[PDB]
Ligand binder design. Sequence first.
Ligand SMILES: [Ca+2]
Ligand code: NA
Length: 936
Amino acid sequence: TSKATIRDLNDPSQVKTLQEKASKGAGTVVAVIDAGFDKNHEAWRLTDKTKARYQSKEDLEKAKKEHGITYGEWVNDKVAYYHDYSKDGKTAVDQEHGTHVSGILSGNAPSETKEPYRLEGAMPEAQLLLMRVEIVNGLADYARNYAQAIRDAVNLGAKVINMSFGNAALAYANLPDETKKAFDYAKSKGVSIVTSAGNDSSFGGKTRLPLADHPDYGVVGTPAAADSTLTVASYSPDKQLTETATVKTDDHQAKEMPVLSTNRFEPNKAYDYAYANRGMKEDDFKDVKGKIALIERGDIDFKDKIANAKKAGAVGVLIYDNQDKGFPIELPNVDQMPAAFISRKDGLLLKDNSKKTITFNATPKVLPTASDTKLSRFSSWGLTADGNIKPDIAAPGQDILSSVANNKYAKLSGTSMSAPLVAGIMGLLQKQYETQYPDMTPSERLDLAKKVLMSSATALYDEDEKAYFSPRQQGAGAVDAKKASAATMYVTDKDNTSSKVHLNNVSDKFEVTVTVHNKSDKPQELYYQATVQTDKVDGKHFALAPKALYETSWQKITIPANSSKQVTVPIDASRFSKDLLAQMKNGYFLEGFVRFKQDPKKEELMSIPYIGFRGDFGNLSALEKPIYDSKDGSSYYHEANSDAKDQLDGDGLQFYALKNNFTALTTESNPWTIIKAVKEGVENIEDIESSEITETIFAGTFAKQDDDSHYYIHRHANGKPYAAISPNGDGNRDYVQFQGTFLRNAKNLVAEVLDKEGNVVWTSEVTEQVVKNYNNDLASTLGSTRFEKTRWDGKDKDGKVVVNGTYTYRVRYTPISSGAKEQHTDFDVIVDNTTPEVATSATFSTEDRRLTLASKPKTSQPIYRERIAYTYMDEDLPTTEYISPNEDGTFTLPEEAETMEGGTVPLKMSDFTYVVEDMAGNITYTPVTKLLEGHS
Ligand SMILES: [Ca+2]
Ligand code: NA
């Protein structure tokens, strides 16, 4: 029995055509640098080991000796080398991702596989060098480790190195020099390095849209940002080999639909199903018992919808999209529950179908995708931190079936899956070129291969928008191995360095110059046109969709044999500026593709992207304005309480900092009971000595005298936040520290204090590298960052507390863009260490229980709170509550306190304490019994 391969049934990138020309990798070596692998998978095999570069452990050891490599080992005929460059890591090794990526590149499953179709990667007959690397310490360390892996791969003979991993938003400039040299080393040896773009979409993440005011929303990081690598974005072709389910529709006709299942349904079993809305309430499931629950996506998590269906006795789950032309989403495994994701159209078909019975088939088949040809929502957008164009090209990355741990298979989505496909195509094209262009050096063939793959890639078109997807999302287009293998021409920028044109900043009128290279022995004539486009905007947000402005007229060019010729396309978008600026006030991209054809009526032959920015890109604001300045109290990652726009509670007892992610200043509130306990040397305080807590809060915020559980922003008459500190070491409002939501990466972040008299009296340590807060999720990065180096303790550069007064706490930082001006954000900060002068005696009226103080408080800063606290035992815990003064200045003392259990506890005069605090946090606390004894 000989099984067909998945590629035999579906080959969106036309890899077979290139293989017809360049074979399947026999005799070649390729490397994968990832997080771990199943080195024993059945997919790791060669049809004829006699043709391999390394025919034995001895052949391998010989190569190792030649290069002085004294580690790593031969595994089997397919995996000629394996080394873990991150063994110091205590955590376990994940084998799924690396195995899956490697499978797409070089899997070669035998017919004895349990699968219906054999996994046969792009270069199934090549040997693999598998290198494990993982972050175990810092990122610089990590980069030095994968740098050695790259170098070892090159020396061990790899022709391509796939790196389907990365860290969002990092700048290439910050990588260790040894890492930069390793990329250059591979390039100098003609070894292609392919990187995944990332799955972070744009600033804000896959669940949000970035703001139109802030155009630098790219999140591609490293290693992708390295210019020498070929970075791959992910898209979905218009058809996919998918598992399916069959249903009978009204017409009495059978209808097949794609399904993406987690866990397994009983094949060929007719199941009954019931609609259950968005599966939020039990009511919804009032009929799913013993049937499959059909649930619409939205509102709540997939896991919840699934758990709820299980509760109601459902035997399986069908979740249909709430988006039109969406993508299949891998549903969570909630305690083995069979759960399948289907398109909205298919879900709606099931929803209103007479015979509510469905069957799952065992044989997968190719069916159209609900998305049609479309870039993946998760694919990372460029530009890179220093403004270079990435990604470079796109490849299929949705629900790709490949090898996983323990000799199994599974579908995974990600640019991680797109990359190895391109890596294999690059390897085969390089092999083809060893025959086609034998007189070039390995480096020259590599350069040619990358240019041809990018030029021949087909620019994808957004049908809904009537425009090509932005080059910042798809790079030079979707890879096509057939077009690449057939190509005898390619297109580059005027300097012949890359198949993309970066114009940096532009006015409404600019020129796009392209060089067409002809490697044929005959002159060739082409027609070319340029699309002119920008970002589509919906309200205050970028839609992450293209907006066509116009397309130029087709012009012609004849390129002599074995030569090149430049063409220049004049662009003028002056007529759109008024409307575009109204939408994108700080500037917008003017970009597109210069497309080439043999005839205007024929298909696109080549396309090269160009990108310019109508504005001053390098100087776009790097920091989101302070939350205090927001008119409606909201920010990108923080929604206000419309009912109270000035409410701004602090950290409370939260464990993670998912809330309140915005730019502001932090400080700490230390209640008098804790200040007292610390001054007295009490060691165990929390939940023992007091019921109050030390809380990290935002500077400029204050609680009301009658606690309501909230803090509110207070501002000077001028509108600035009333930030004030009392640097006296009691932990109560002793300092201010910068917290920022960075919209763009930055460098050399430093805080300084001006005395508003012309002098800088203090300067913090510098935070050299700042990464934009591209999401607000524990799985990637939080929406804001607290910079401990900027903490100011109210002391000057000589180490002494500055005199009472108002100062400017200035935070400076510079964008990464070449030549950007330093930017800064300022906050007025008051320093006042004046202790309140308060009554030293009092008298008490037993009749009405009113306490009258001998005098009123005198404070430098306005009074914040003046209260009488009472601490009573509630299950052995000294619990404190407060009393605000009467309008005549006296305080009415209660005779008892109510406990949580609902009981009562008598209060003694010794339970009361007079506490006075000013707006800088200066405070006094005197036992009421002491005031009463305050008489001679
Ligand atoms: Ca203080
Ligand atoms: Na292209």
